[PDB]
Amino acid sequence: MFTINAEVRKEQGKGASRRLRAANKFPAIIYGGKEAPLAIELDHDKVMNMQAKAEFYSEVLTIVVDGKEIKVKAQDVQRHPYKPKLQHIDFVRA
Amino acid sequence: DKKSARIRRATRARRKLQELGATRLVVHRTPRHIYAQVIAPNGSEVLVAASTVEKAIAEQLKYTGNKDAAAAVGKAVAERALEKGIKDVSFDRSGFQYHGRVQALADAAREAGLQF
Amino acid sequence: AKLHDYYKDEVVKKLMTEFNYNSVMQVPRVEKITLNMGVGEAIADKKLLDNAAADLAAISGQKPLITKARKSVAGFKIRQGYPIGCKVTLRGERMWEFFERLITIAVPRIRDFRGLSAKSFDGRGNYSMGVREQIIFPEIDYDKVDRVRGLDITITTTAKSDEEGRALLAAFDFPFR
Amino acid sequence: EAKRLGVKRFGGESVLAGSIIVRQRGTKFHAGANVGCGRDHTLFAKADGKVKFEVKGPKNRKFISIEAE
RNA sequence: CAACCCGAUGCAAACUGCGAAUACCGGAGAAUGUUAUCACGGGAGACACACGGCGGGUGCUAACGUCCGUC
RNA sequence: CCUCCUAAAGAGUAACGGAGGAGCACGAAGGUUGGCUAAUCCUGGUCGGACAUCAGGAGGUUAGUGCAAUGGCAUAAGCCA
RNA sequence: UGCCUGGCGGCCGUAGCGCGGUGGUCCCACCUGACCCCAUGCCGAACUCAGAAGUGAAACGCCGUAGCGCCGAUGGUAGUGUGGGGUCUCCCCAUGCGAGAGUAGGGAACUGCCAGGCA
């Protein structure tokens, strides 16, 4: 029922994370199962609008990446110390 | 505990002999049975071993464990070792007291034609 | 021996019957007895310690070993390595005969005999109490009595629970609390 | 005076008999094969070869060993 | 009102269950460098250095202050 | 003379910069062989005040390891013969 | 040789701790006496002399339990070498190396030699 937009990820490192954050975006990861964990790039404001929902804590997220629908869940979220910005997120293929 | 104390007492000689790196004959004792082996310098291989529980050496013994049994086991170990060609092993009494059956078997091994 | 055979004959039978034990040796078995003398006045004089040790040796089958200081405390003014008392470690025929002789006559003939305590246990079935007026014992005659002195009596048993101590007291018939 | 401390010779470095590997005030390392501890808790080689460091024991004690060439 | 005490709540130039990058030492390897490396011998000169960047001691985390290791 | 910082995960590295001990000692407090293993709390205890020592449980070196300190010491470098 | 048990190495909290269960075929443990091998700062305390009297109980071997505890990614974060910029107490930029904690996941370990019994 919930819509999610995802884009491929190809760069790794602190510099890459800085570039993503400066571009009004940020990275996230999906891990779990025998399938290889992988990173996915997400934007900042639209993903914040998604996370604003209060039912996220008990909802399975439907990631649409590379024309494929994957059911995952976010066990942990990395949040900026005090500023209201998200720099990284964790997901598991539930 | 008794086994732990015996092992830790033996540990001194057990670790000291490793630096020397020579073949070592050890004997484990128990009123029920007496076992013996000739461990190689690596500490994981043995050229010969005997056990009173096995009848091959306990057929002539009135019981598996006794002073005569220890002497016979020591003699058998020494003669098997001599025929195998140990070439001057060293001695280790499994951290026991050298006053009884261990002493008897050690003397039997010495008189069997050994030089330790 | 004299008490050991009777113990194995009847105490073991009653204990196994009441505790429906399956193993033969699950019934409690006594390890030893300890008869210590921790008066604490030995600092005042050393001759009293020697006399009490001789008395313990006479009553028992062996001479007690002396016990030295454990930890010094400034307040009480006690040093290290200074003997204060001694203990007899009764084991074997000696403990058997001594305990038999005690339980025969000594225990019944005590003033203010309110009965021994069955709740006072260390926590693993060892009964360790203290009793004064050593004159209760027969071996301490008026000829050799020096002063009314206390003692500590403990029974060391292979049991690991207080139920076993209670069962042993029942076997001894435990006159009353 | 500033007394010298530290590992004189590290792992993988050739040593000769009578050469001190690590001069330590206490016992932070223990001799293994062809290594000896002096009266002053100094580790010295008893042969010629390469030096190696390992960790073993109940307390994860560090052992210095020597392998001949 | 308040010890020991569970959660903690702050600090440690002489705290570490854990724990970097740099700096030092050993081995192997392509490449470049007029051997740029070491030993011996002859000859010296200098023996109040100044300023600035980097991370600090100190000063009142005021001063073009004070002293460190490196450049 | 020695121990710890300033002193920047090698050593060393300055200030009338920052904190401390000693001129010792053993013929046993050394060696060898065989054995053993703390401070700390609770339980009962004429004397016992919680704070002489005593028998049992845990604890696992916070004890001790001669001097001030540092690093090590349980295989003990600590204790007995 | 398939299993249980014991001895000799490695590895040193994946081997550890708590809890439930199982074990005497072999092995191991338990026992009295000890005047004899050996000894008590008393004690047969420990070791040693006889073996099973019988048991598998304290202890010990083993199975289950992911309870405690332990190990622990990818990623991200703090940090930092190099050159530069700024509003130069400190931050950022391009670039290289990268934490710890925690998540996923792992696991009730595994392994070399010899001996007894159960086939």
Residue numbers in the entry:
A (entry chain V): 1 to 94
B (entry chain O): 2 to 117
C (entry chain F): 1 to 177
D (entry chain W): 13 to 81
Quoted from the paper:
The E. coli 50S large ribosomal subunit is composed of 33 proteins (L-proteins), one 23S and one 5S rRNA. The 23S rRNA consists of six architectural domains that, stabilized by the L-proteins, define the shape of the 50S subunit with its three protuberances. Here, we present a biochemical and cryo-EM based analysis of the earliest period of 50S assembly, utilizing an in vitro reconstitution system with purified rRNA and L-protein components. Taken together, early 50S assembly occurs in a domain-wise fashion, while late 50S assembly proceeds incrementally.
To differentiate states occurring during late assembly, emerging structural features such as the central protuberance, or helix 68 were added to their names (C-CP, or C-CP-H68). Late 50S assembly, apart from core-stabilizing incorporation of uL2, involves stable binding of bL9 and bL28 in state C-CP_L28, which stabilizes the base of the L1 stalk.
